[PDB]
Design a protein around this ligand. Sequence first.
Ligand SMILES: NC(=O)c1ccc[n+]([C@@H]2O[C@H](COP(=O)([O-])OP(=O)(O)OC[C@H]3O[C@@H](n4cnc5c(N)ncnc54)[C@H](OP(=O)(O)O)[C@@H]3O)[C@@H](O)[C@H]2O)c1
Ligand SMILES: NC(=O)c1ccc[n+]([C@@H]2O[C@H](COP(=O)([O-])OP(=O)(O)OC[C@H]3O[C@@H](n4cnc5c(N)ncnc54)[C@H](OP(=O)(O)O)[C@@H]3O)[C@@H](O)[C@H]2O)c1
Lengths: 413, 413
Amino acid sequence: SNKISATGVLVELDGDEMTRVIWKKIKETLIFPFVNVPIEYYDLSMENRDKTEDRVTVEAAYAIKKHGVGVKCATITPDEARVKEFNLKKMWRSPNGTIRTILGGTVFREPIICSNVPRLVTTWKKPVVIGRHAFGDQYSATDAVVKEPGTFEMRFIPANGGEPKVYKVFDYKSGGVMMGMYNTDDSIRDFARSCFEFALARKWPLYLSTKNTILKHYDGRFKDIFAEMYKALYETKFKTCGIFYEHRLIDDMVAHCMRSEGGYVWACKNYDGDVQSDSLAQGFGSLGMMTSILMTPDGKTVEVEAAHGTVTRHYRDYQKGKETSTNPVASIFAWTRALAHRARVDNNNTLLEFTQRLEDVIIATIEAGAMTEDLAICIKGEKNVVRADYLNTDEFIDAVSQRLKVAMQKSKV
Amino acid sequence: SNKISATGVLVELDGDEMTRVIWKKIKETLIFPFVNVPIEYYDLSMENRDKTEDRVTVEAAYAIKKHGVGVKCATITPDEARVKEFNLKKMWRSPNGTIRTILGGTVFREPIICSNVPRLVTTWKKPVVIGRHAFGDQYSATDAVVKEPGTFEMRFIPANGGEPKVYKVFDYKSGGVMMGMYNTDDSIRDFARSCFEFALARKWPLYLSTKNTILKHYDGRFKDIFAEMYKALYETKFKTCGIFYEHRLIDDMVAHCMRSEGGYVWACKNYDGDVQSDSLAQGFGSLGMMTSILMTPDGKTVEVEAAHGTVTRHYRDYQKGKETSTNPVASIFAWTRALAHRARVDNNNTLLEFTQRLEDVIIATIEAGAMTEDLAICIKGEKNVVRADYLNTDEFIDAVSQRLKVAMQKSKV
Ligand SMILES: NC(=O)c1ccc[n+]([C@@H]2O[C@H](COP(=O)([O-])OP(=O)(O)OC[C@H]3O[C@@H](n4cnc5c(N)ncnc54)[C@H](OP(=O)(O)O)[C@@H]3O)[C@@H](O)[C@H]2O)c1
Ligand SMILES: NC(=O)c1ccc[n+]([C@@H]2O[C@H](COP(=O)([O-])OP(=O)(O)OC[C@H]3O[C@@H](n4cnc5c(N)ncnc54)[C@H](OP(=O)(O)O)[C@@H]3O)[C@@H](O)[C@H]2O)c1
């Protein structure tokens, strides 16, 4: 007679702009009509993080750290332009900058994938997640220009005070630039732990990639850490759930992304992941089809969200009058996924089977020919798509809504 | 009523193993039967590079210098387990090493591209090159592990005596790794010129790919140098030849690669192309299908060669009895496309008519049904393919040969 409970708690973390509007729909149309929902709500609207001098976000972030599952962060990283927008006040940072430094750990981008929609590499029969390492490599690494002849040396000084090993690297004829780059073991190691826990949780196998050939120490340290930790802390369980861990050269792995079937996690280093996640954002479909999943290296904590932004370009119209067909599917797949790690964790098999439901029904809806405007450009033509069988945001969410209400039905009696 | 002559001299680099076989019949069947030519023959055969303590290759390398065109270098970079092979003398190094070192400048890889054999991304209706950097980025840029808590500093020391500069980049709470990197303008200025000079002759546009946003001084430096240079030393001549130069973020430029049609040269910095070329080795067609033009920054000297190695695997047999289907199109393109620049240089518009012929004919050849086994796995099915539709190494070369003989004639009357 009732709905679907859960003993755990999902931290809701509200947004603003166009995402906020759609946030109430999927919330109201797809989630609460079927799910009982113990929620610790944190409003992150620009208005409201301002009121809270400094922030809600530190609260909300830690809230997530208590509960282990969080959902939304539709951001606003304000500008100087923005304060001018609605009388904001001094500074503010970026909400996610705070959360990702609080929770710590690593983000993983899962495409939404559907038979009818055109991948720019047709090969992909399943989605490929990518784990990118954000601690300083060349992201925290200085680099100075050189305007005269001279010598650039690296010097390692111990904190006891030994022979403070020196490095004659290069004496300049004339002109140029220089750089230094650093990455500690507990950084590399933490990043590994995450991958292992997230691949283990998504039931899929794991691939590393680097270029240790021409960086024998730096990138040798990655190969090492992962492979020992695999055979130390995961190996058997990874064996248990039928899922290897194999390292390949980046050379091999950008090709393997190209040529392989898909359905695995891929670990790339800090640089590589910026390069190749912006690659697969155009490739697998559109922004509005990926999510973003911050997992912790303990593997006990998740913040899921849509990969695409707090889409203002549409918010103009909203009810300034004109219709808009912003893609909710990444916003829904925010919740479905979140609910899943809530489900998985609480053992709870019932919500899980339901998140599985909604997801499959959103796939089935698009492949079934009713889709948003954004995908209607991909399926055929930029210059020749009219409002034939593609829907409004709302009409679209209804189309699944009704399609889920039959899936609810047909399964049980 | 005669063959076709060239004015200026071409320089042959005859190599060893399986390639040096095909090189005869390619060079017999297709080349001199229609083509007068000045060559200056280097046998770079182990046996005949062994004799010389201090190699033939330094004279060949210096040959090509003077002549501005050069053709073969199908290598053998000898071995520990190779000196054993055939009573060698000690070490030798690799030619491809030596030569690039003298000649200088920048190697460029262009896919051989035909309709029936598939690109592993269907977009590519044309061939795309790559210019890698290669030297002193991370290539000469050493690194060590940091094995205990302590500080890693950088120091530029001049070579006049002014105040030195100094950076406390990072201190290690414990453990890890460190790495610095250095890259002079003259290098960049060489990488740019080569590119610019090389697009210029191909009639193809240019895109760079860097990450200056996230490496301000280091990667700003290139975004810069090509800009000035274009408008300083190229642009209007590009404008003239309907070509151009734009820059895109590395992020955008692996993504553009995927979605762009093809027919433009692209430069990625030393890392960014050591990654992305193995990618396209599987990605566009096969090894056996790329070639490899070193062009000097002066834009005045060229060494072309096949991608793939001096394919020892297939040679074992040769007459050890059994047939073979090593794919010669690269080795051939390595004549045609050398015969191309030679022409450009002599402004011999007539010969150029010829190099065109044999590239177009090999296109015809394959599309029409004739292929070697390597493509007989690529069109379809390693798990079922037989000798019906795939020519031998040498029946294939005759397949072209007949067809060029129709072309040569069935055009000119
Ligand atoms: N940590 C961060 O910095 C972060 C992360 C996420 C968001 N944000 C915030 O989001 C705000 C706006 O971001 P932005 O406009 O720069 O990036 P964005 O929100 O992703 O929008 C850029 C373009 O993406 C398309 N798009 C976005 N969501 C879509 C959807 N659901 N369906 C279809 N198309 C969609 C829109 O295309 P068309 O309208 O052209 O169809 C839009 O023009 C910013 O104020 C930013 O601070 C910040
Ligand atoms: N600068 C350098 O150091 C350099 C560069 C190039 C080559 N080499 C030298 O070349 C020698 C052999 O190297 P390698 O055999 O590892 O590389 P390779 O000559 O490219 O052959 C390796 C594999 O590639 C495939 N292959 C190569 N050419 C082909 C063609 N024309 N058609 C179809 N498939 C082809 C073969 O595949 P299947 O047999 O599996 O079909 C072969 O097993 C070595 O002595 C190496 O040092 C050196």
